[PDB]
Symmetry: D3
C-alpha cells in the first residue's frame, strides 16, 4: 500500500536531485486520503515521518509540515530552521483534530518544534490534494513522477525556478 | 459528447448549489486542456472554447468573474478583464498568452475578452484547477479545499478552493 | 452618578471635543480595561463597558468620528469595527467573536451592539484613547503624539490620549513655516 | 534670468506634447537645478526667476493636457516631493512636514510650494513619467520599468535634460509572444 | 543632589522586580521611553534633567551587565520618536539609520545622555523589540513586537512618573478545537 | 589611451578613488551605453577591465544594469547575491537585449546571476541610462572634474541617510 508507494516515490525523487542540501521541503498530507480513526491515522503519520527523516539524513534537505485549515495552514518546523527575518512564530500545538496527524506527529517527535504562520520554500510534496502552492517559491513548477499515488492519495510534487523575463529579443542561454 | 463538457457542467451546477460563486468575486482558473483529453492546437483550442463558454454561463448567472492562469513559461501570469484590474493590488506585465507559451485556455480567454490585461500575481477568494496545474499561490489566505462529487473533467483531476479568514485567539476564544 | 466613571468620562470627552480631537471621517481606537476603572467581575465590568460604548456613540453622532475597539492579548489585540469601516486594502479580517474573558468587556459589548461588526488583525488610525494602560501606540499613525488633558483618570484608571502628526524632515537649513 | 532657458523649454514641452508624453490625469515629476540652466552659481533672485519661468511654462502644459506636476526637492529635504493636495493619495504616499526653501528644497520646489493652491510634501512618490533638468536624478520616482525618451531638444539653457516614461515589465521565456 | 537622587530608589526596585520575573533576556533589546520632567513632576532645566537622565542611564547599565540585555532609547516626537542604539545592535536588514543627533530640546534628556555615553551610537527611524519600559507615559507600544503584553509590577512610579512595562509573545492562532499545550 | 573612453574612464576612476568613493564590501552599480561612448563589445571590454582593476585595489564589487528590454535587470557575481534582499531572474544578457556591458560582464564573471532589483550605496551612469532607481535613499549626485567618457555624459551617485527632525534638531 502506502509504504511501498512512498518508498518508491522518495527514491525516484532522490534520483532526480529533487532534494538539495540546505533546502526546506514542505509536506502537505492527509493520511485519511492515503487509506481512503486517530490510532490508524497516527500510524500512517509515523511511517511517513520516518521515511522523510531517512531522506533528510541522506540528502541534507529538511522538512516542514503544513497543518490543516483549522490552524490556518500554519507550518511546523524545527527551531534550527526558524528564520525570524522571513518567518513569524505563532502559538498553537498541532493536534489530530486541529492540525492533522502528520503535523501532530512531527511536532511531538522534533527536537525543538515551532509553528510559523507562513513559509516560502523551494519545493514540496502534497499527498491527498491538501494544496501546497501557497508555500512554494515563485515560480512553482509541477514535477512529473512515475509514482502518481501513495496508497489511495493522489500525489503532487512541486519544485521552483526563477521568473523568466525580457522581451522578444531576449536570450535564455 | 464534447470532451469535458458534461463533467464540467455537472461540476459548475454542484458549485452553484453550494454558493461557491459570489457576485463580485474573482475566481481563478488553472487549466491544462491536454489533461482533459489525456493533442494538437486545434483540439486543445476546442477544449479551451468549451471550458471558457461554460464558465461564461456561470458568470452571467452568478455575477462572478474569471481570471485565467497562464503556464509556467509565462511565470503563471494571470489574464483578466481590464475592468477587474486594480493597480493598487496588481501589476500589469507585457506578454500575450500563446498556445505554446501560456496554454490554450489563457490564450482563448485573452482573445475573447473585451479588454484583456495580464498581471504578474493575483489574490482571489476562490479557484478551480483542472489537471493539477496548482492554483494555491493565488487563493486568499486561508485557502480551503472544496469536496465535490465530480472528481474529474474528462481525464483531468479537478481541485476546487475557496477561502476564509484566519481563526485567531487562544484556548478561551469564541467563534460564535 | 449611577455609573462608575461616567462623570470623569463625560468631562474627558467634552475636553477632547473642545480641543478638536474628534474629526469627521477619522477612526479613533479605544483601549480599555474596565477592571482598572473600578479598581479590580463580569456584571460590573460589562456595566462600565456599556457606559463607555454609549458615551462614545453620542460623540460619534456629534462629530462624525467612528470608533474601533481593541481586544485583549488573548485575541492578539485584534480590533473590532463596523463593517462599513473595513478597508480590505489596509486591513485583514480575522475570525473570532470577542468574549468577556477572551477579548475584554468593551470589545465584547461593542461587538454585540454594532450593526455589522467585524474583527481585523491590525489597524492604523490617527488617534486613540487608552483607559487603564492597556497600550494603544501600536495602532496610532506615525508619528504618535500624546495629548495632555486636565482629566487624568476615568474612575481609578489612568487615561492616555494619542493623536498623530507627520514626520518632520530636513537638515539644519530646513524650514517648517 | 527671466529669459534664461525659455526658448529651449518651450520647444521641449511642445515636442513632448506632440509625442503624447503628457496624459490627462497622470502625474509628471520635475527634477530641476536652476543653476544648471544658467551654468554657474547665481543667487536666489536669479534662481527664483528661472524657477518662475519653468513653473509658468509647465502650468500652460497642465491646462492644455490635464497632466499635473510634482516637484522634487534637493537632498537636504531628502528629495521630498511637493504636490497639490488634490493629488495626494494616502494609500500610496506619506505626508511629511517641511516647507521647501531656496537653501533647503531648491528654487523650483520652493516656487511651486508658494504658488500651488494647496501644497503638501510627500516622502516618496511613484509616477509614470518625469523631466530632469540638470542631472538631479529622477529615476527613483518613475514607475518600473523606467524608459528614457529621445528628444530633439537636449538642453534647457546649459542644463542637460533627461526625459523618462514608463512601461510594464516584459515577461516570459523564449517562446513568449508580445503581439 | 536633589536631581542626582530623584527616582533612583524606585527605579532600582523596579529593575530588581523585573529581573526576578525574568523580564531581561541575554541578547534582547529593551526599549526605554522616558520623560525626566515627569520623574520630578514639574518642568526642570537642562542641568537637572540631565542629572535625572544620568541616574536612569546608569541604573539601566547595571542591569545590562547583569543580564546581557541591551537598551534602546526612544527620542521625543520632535525627532519623530527616532531611536538611539549602539551600532553593534544595528541590523540594516530590519532598521534604517537616520541623521540626527539627540539634544535636550530635540530628543529629550535621556536619549541625549545615552547618545553621548554610548561607545558608537546610531539613530534609527523605527525599531521592533521584544520588551520595553515607559517612564512618564511617552508611549512605547509602536516599538514592541506583536503581540505586546503589559507586565504588572508592584512599583507603579519612578519618582512622580507613571511607569508602564511591556513584554511580547506570539499570536495565538487556530479555531475552537486548537490546542496550546 | 586611444581605445575609446579609456583615458577619460581611467581619470574618472582615479578621481573617485581619491575621494574615497569606492569602499571595501560595497556594491557599485554601473549603468552603461557603449554606443553613447563612441557616438560596442570592445568598449564594454575596456570598461569592464578598468572596473576590475578598481575592484582588486579597493574591494568594491560591481553590478551591471541591463537595458530596458530586460527590465533593467542587474547582473552580479553570485557571491554578492543576497536572497533576503534580491530575487534571481532567468535571462542571459545579449548585445541587443541587455546591452554590451552587461553582456560582457555576464560572460566574464566567475559565477554570474541576474536579479530583478537591487539597492546599492553608489553608482556610475555612462550615457544617461538612469540609475537612481538602484541607489539607496537618499541618493546624492557626486560632482567630478571628468564630465564625459568619450562622448557619453557621465553621472555619479552616492547615498546618505535621511535627515530628520524639526527646527530645533541638531546634526552634530
Amino acid at each position: 500500500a502506502g509504504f511501498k508507494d512512498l518508498t518508491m516515490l522518495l527514491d525516484e525523487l532522490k534520483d532526480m536531485s529533487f532534494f538539495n542540501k540546505g533546502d526546506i521541503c514542505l509536506i502537505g498530507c492527509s493520511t485519511s486520503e492515503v487509506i481512503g480513526g486517530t490510532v490508524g491515522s497516527m500510524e500512517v503519520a509515523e511511517t511517513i515521518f520516518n521515511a522523510l527523516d531517512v531522506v533528510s539524513k541522506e540528502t541534507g534537505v529538511t522538512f516542514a509540515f503544513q497543518g490543516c485549515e483549522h490552524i490556518n495552514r500554519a507550518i511546523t518546523i524545527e527551531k534550527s530552521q526558524y528564520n525570524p527575518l522571513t518567518m513569524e512564530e505563532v502559538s498553537v500545538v498541532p493536534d489530530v483534530h486541529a492540525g492533522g496527524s502528520l503535523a501532530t506527529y512531527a511536532f511531538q517527535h522534533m527536537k525543538d518544534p515551532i509553528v510559523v504562520e507562513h513559509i516560502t520554500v523551494p519545493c514540496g510534496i502534497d499527498i491527498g490534494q491538501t494544496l501546497i502552492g501557497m508555500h512554494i517559491k515563485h515560480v512553482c513548477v509541477p514535477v512529473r513522477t512515475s509514482v502518481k499515488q501513495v496508497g489511495q492519495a493522489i500525489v503532487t510534487i512541486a519544485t521552483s525556478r526563477p521568473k523568466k523575463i525580457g522581451g522578444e529579443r531576449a536570450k535564455y542561454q
